[PDB]
Design a protein around this ligand. Structure first.
Ligand code: MG
Ligand code: MG
Ligand code: MG
Ligand code: MG
Ligand code: MG
Ligand code: MG
Ligand code: MG
Lengths: 287, 54, 110, 95, 24, 152, 52, 54
RNA sequence: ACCUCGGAGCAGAACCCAACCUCCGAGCAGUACAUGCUAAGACUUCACCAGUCAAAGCGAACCUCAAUUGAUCCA
């Protein structure tokens, strides 16, 4: 354009005409002279000029504001609460339409990390990613997804098109493993087994209305029929679809992966996988 | 009245409802000094947890 | 990042439309991002200033500025105070105008 | 509040602010009126109800509580059963 | 269309003995 | 391929089939209180943005075959204010911004109306806030009657 | 002169309040509202923790 | 006529019964000019009124 | 001589204003505990900490005086 036409002439651009963008480099103020001199911008004498000032919050013997108020159970045990990153169905459909989330493979946590739709932090007490029913309307995907926390509306909207919701629990170690598996493989330690949910999550993960991974599969169709009668719409049968073998991937626990197995050391260099032998190791990994 | 509007005027029966003006609320400031916790619910649209980019 | 697959109904849901092929004979041009999105964002400086910035502007900035001014004139009644920045492909427009500019750039040919 | 420590050289917080206040992501601190549990036999029920309300702070108080804390207490938490989840985001704001 | 459907969205009442008959 | 002690098949030996969790129980859950969706005309004619969605559903009540005669007559008599001119039962809700919640609320309303229309022995709660003046006016209008004969 | 006592309810144990009383009189048996019952039950003076 | 019942023009009103040339007490011998029509008050409307102008 | 607060003139007709200017006082009381629970809108002792009035609903038969007082921690 005109930029190259104007740059065709004129002397060369070397280290002799380096002009910084105006407004970014502000001149440095020096307390020397008449404008910024005398007191160097410190006012009159006293503690304001000598620098011997009390700490932030001291009101000169008067009881400060943050002391006269009694304590209350606001942040009692915030370092032990279970936090879950939100995930709406609208953003899931957006990722599927863009292509970063392919609806042909089972979607769990590592797939969402690779697609970079949610940011799962191994620290800050995060036990997975929850599900949000904000994108209920205009949601046509039909794909199984494994969510740690899925609401009733979200599960219903997923089952309308023909999806499978799997509620599973993982310890923070499993979260760190599933987030970035490449450094876990470069580590050199074998794949551990999944840990059981705590005492305050067994009735939640062993229930039928929550689609847990430990509940009996005999109460799932009843809950699906109840949700179909509640939220309307005729419930379709996935037994006649072509992707029946893909939706049946319920992910057996004590795996924290997919097609691998706990105790299988993974080596990046030289594509070879080693199987543990003996019998105590197998009994411990299959317990 | 239904039968009258049906077999006497050849039209539909109009309905009404005694509506009331919305309640008055001052301008929502940035720092509500000395206000209860329910001050944010006075200007809230829907009482449901909304989600933006998430 | 791979390219998005060509859908069957181009009115693809969740608000997304791919740019058309041989785009129109215009002095200016608006590029895309990594996620194949329309570069129409918002920005705030202090606590009351509100404007939108089109960070991808390639070509004649004055033409696009005049076009958006004539488009936003009937929506405000006055002249939108904009900044014609040429060193960078930016064009700040005072006021919350995000979805409107997105729809205009999608229907224009970008 | 120790602007520079002797081991990490970072900024430290005041645990009293955390135990006596609760900061929301919008930029507001939830406090409690003092004297809501002592000498309740000489107070009218209206005063007892007024003292048992989550009152917000002011501008200088919020600025002081923010300066007394670091960047960890100014994030956004996503608890499972958070009763103050609807108060994190503040809608319908016109300067 | 029916010409007798002139109802209008707003309907007024010119009776003073009306507001107290509906407890409003 | 892999399975441990805490597997799905070992914890529940009675449920080991590959399709035991997807078999739709349609043959054992086809009662008359299911509300057929093929004869319902559900439409959405509102998109507010005060973000609330409207889900209007109407159906010809006089041609409903899944409803018995006495319960239909009772629900038509006790709800004669929501019937359209062509015999359409217009029922809508305005609570949530999602269409699924509004549809579920409308279905629940229809279900409770059906289950209360059949139950005739229902104790009516005596209220005194809006019907007392109506009863007083009716009694005062009935009191001023003292003629002898009138036809028409 | 006066004294502050606590009244325990007969029905629905767990709700108690405080009320003033003379020091040279007997106990109290008044009618106070009970939120767990939403009615009116009896209250008996029991355990004084104030001597004003 | 009904003072309250006109849906279009608020200041105007409707017509119900109208007679003319009534030979004194003979209210059955005069000519007719407007068929009788029962009142049709709206649902959500207030309390309408009809006055007999003789 | 005083260490907290209220009233009368200084300060006269919206408001605020001090003195080691001159006077009355108060650290309580005579009777029922719905002296129950929520919830629009304001004044605010010249800042803050504090105090006070109240629309309406569920619940029930159909409150007087002027100051009249005590926070953080802990038990
Ligand atoms: Mg000096
Ligand atoms: Mg000095
Ligand atoms: Mg010092
Ligand atoms: Mg001191
Ligand atoms: Mg910015
Ligand atoms: Mg003030
Ligand atoms: Mg009241």
């Amino acid at each position: 354009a005109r930029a190259l036409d104007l740059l065709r002439g004129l002397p060369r651009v070397s280290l002799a005409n380096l002009k910084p963008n105006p407004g970014s480099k502000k001149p440095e103020r020096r307390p020397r002279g008449r404008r910024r001199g005398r007191k160097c911008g410190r006012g009159h004498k006293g503690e304001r000029q000598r620098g011997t000032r009390p700490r932030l919050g001291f009101e000169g013997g008067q009881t400060p504001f943050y002391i006269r108020i009694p304590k209350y159970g606001f942040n009692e045990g915030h370092s032990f609460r279970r936090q879950y990153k939100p995930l709406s169905l609208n953003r899931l459909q957006y990722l599927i339409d863009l292509g970063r989330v392919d609806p042909s493979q089972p979607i769990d946590l590592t797939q969402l990390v690779n697609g970079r739709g949610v940011t799962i932090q191994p620290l800050k007490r995060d036990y997975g990613v929850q599900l949000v029913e904000e994108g209920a309307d205009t949601f046509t995907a039909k794909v199984n997804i494994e969510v740690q926390l899925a609401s009733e509306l979200a599960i219903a909207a997923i089952e309308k098109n023909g999806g499978v919701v799997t509620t599973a629990f993982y310890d923070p170690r499993s979260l760190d493993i599933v987030c970035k598996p490449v450094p876990f493989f470069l580590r050199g330690q074998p794949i551990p087994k999944r840990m059981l949910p705590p005492e305050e999550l067994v009735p939640y993960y062993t229930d039928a209305k929550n689609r847990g991974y430990l509940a009996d599969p005999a109460k799932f169709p009843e809950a699906r029929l109840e949700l179909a009668r509640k939220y309307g719409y005729i419930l379709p049968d996935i037994t006649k679809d072509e992707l029946f073998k893909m939706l049946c991937t319920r992910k057996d626990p004590r795996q924290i992966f997919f097609g691998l197995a706990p105790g299988w050391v993974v080596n990046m260099a030289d594509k070879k996988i080693l199987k543990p032998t003996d019998e105590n190791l197998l009994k411990y990994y299959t317990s | 009245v239904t039968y009258i509007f049906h077999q006497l005027l050849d039209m539909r029966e109009p309905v009404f409802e005694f509506v009331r003006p919305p309640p008055y609320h001052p301008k929502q400031k940035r720092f509500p000094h000395r206000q209860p916790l329910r001050y944010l619910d006075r200007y809230r649209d829907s009482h449901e947890p909304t989600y933006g980019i998430y | 990042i791979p390219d998005p697959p060509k859908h069957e109904h181009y009115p693809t849901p969740s608000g997304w439309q791919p740019p058309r092929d041989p785009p129109p004979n215009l002095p200016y041009f608006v590029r895309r991002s990594r996620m194949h999105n329309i570069p129409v964002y918002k920005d705030i400086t202090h606590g009351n200033r509100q404007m939108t910035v089109i960070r991808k502007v390639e070509g004649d900035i004055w033409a696009l500025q005049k076009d958006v001014e004539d488009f936003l004139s009937p929506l405000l009644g006055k002249t939108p105070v904009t900044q014609v920045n040429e060193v960078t492909g930016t064009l700040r427009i005072k006021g919350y105008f995000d979805q409107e500019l997105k729809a205009w750039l999608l229907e224009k040919g970008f | 509040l120790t602007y520079f420590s002797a081991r990490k050289g970072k900024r430290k917080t005041v645990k009293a602010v955390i135990d006596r206040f609760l900061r929301l992501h919008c930029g507001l601190w939830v406090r409690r009126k003092a004297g809501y549990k002592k000498k309740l036999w000489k107070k009218t029920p209206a005063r007892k109800k007024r003292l048992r309300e989550f009152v917000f702070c002011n501008k200088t108080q919020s600025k002081l509580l923010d300066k007394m804390t670091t960047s960890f207490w100014k994030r956004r938490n996503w608890y499972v059963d958070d009763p103050y989840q609807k108060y994190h985001d503040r809608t319908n704001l016109k300067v | 269309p029916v010409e007798n459907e002139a109802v209008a969205p707003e309907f007024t009442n010119r009776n003073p003995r009306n507001l107290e008959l509906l407890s409003v | 391929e892999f399975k441990s002690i805490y597997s799905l098949d070992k914890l529940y030996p009675e449920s080991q089939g590959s399709d035991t969790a997807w078999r739709v129980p349609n043959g054992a859950k086809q009662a008359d209180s299911d509300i057929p969706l093929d004869r319902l005309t559900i439409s959405y004619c509102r998109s507010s943005g005060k973000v609330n969605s409207k889900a209007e559903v109407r159906f010809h009540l006089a041609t409903a075959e899944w409803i018995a005669e006495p319960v239909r007559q009772k629900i038509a008599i006790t709800h004669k204010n929501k019937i359209n001119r062509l015999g359409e039962l217009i029922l809508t809700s305005e609570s949530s911004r999602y269409q699924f919640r509004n549809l579920a609320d409308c279905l629940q309303k229809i279900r409770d109306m059906i289950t209360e229309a059949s139950q005739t022995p229902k104790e009516p709660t005596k209220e005194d806030v809006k019907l007392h003046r109506i009863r007083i006016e009716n009694m005062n209008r009935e009191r001023l009657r003292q003629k002898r004969i009138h036809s028409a | 002169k006066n004294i502050l006592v606590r009244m325990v309810s007969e029905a629905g144990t767990g709700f108690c309040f405080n009320t003033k009383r003379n020091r040279l009189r007997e106990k109290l048996t008044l009618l106070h509202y009970d939120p767990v019952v939403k009615q009116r039950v009896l209250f008996v003076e029991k355990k004084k923790i104030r001597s004003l | 006529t009904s003072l309250d019942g006109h849906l279009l023009e608020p200041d105007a009103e409707y017509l119900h019964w109208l007679l003319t040339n009534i030979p004194g007490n003979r209210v059955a011998e005069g000519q007719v000019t407007c068929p009788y029509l029962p009142p049709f008050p709206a649902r959500g409307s207030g309390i309408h009124r009809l006055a007999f102008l003789l």
